[PDB]
Design a protein around this ligand. Sequence first.
Ligand SMILES: *[C@@H]1O[C@H](CO)[C@@H](O)[C@H](O)[C@H]1NC(C)=O
Ligand SMILES: [Ca+2]
Lengths: 105, 105
Amino acid sequence: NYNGNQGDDFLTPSGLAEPRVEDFGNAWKLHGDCQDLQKQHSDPCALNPRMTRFSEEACAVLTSPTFEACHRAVSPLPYLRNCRYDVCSCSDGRECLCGALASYA
Amino acid sequence: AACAGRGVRVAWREPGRCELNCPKGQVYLQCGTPCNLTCRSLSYPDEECNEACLEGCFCPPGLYMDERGDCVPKAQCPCYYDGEIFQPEDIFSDHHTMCYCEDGF
Ligand SMILES: *[C@@H]1O[C@H](CO)[C@@H](O)[C@H](O)[C@H]1NC(C)=O
Ligand SMILES: [Ca+2]
């Protein structure tokens, strides 16, 4: 609702804020035959364990000294979570790495 | 062009007059086949094409013309679906479908 507050952004058309991001997002789906998302599986590296070592080692650049000038201008932590998710679960983790780093930059 | 409209083909261009110097990596042909020049021809191969061999700039025999008009191998062509453009090895799935881009299709 662009009101300066995070605490009500999970508002829904029923006028209540869902504490679950899944039920929040489901309440904004435009079509009735779309499946309701039951649970959002954070940290998808469990489904491809081969990817986790690279996902960590590569996305840790966001918290490395190269971004240190930015770390006090924008907090890197959401971008690091997004990066590790992206690299662990996408069609090409190199492109997803570059997209996450570009997103923080 | 009137000659070609009567089936007579003339090699009339010379370095002294009116060389059809080609864009990008393309090469001149006095007569080349239009039906298989573009990556769209890979993306819509079931569509019939019968247009005559004609003068112009064409990709070398193993390469297809991309959106920006340079010539790429068949594997590097993007794919066209519902009027949207997908890069090689792109995947998508939806409640009705699951599709991927390879060899321009
Ligand atoms: C287009 O078709 C001709 C045969 O009609 C073939 O010689 C040529 O290699 C084809 N072009 C490509 C890029 O495959
Ligand atoms: Ca708000």
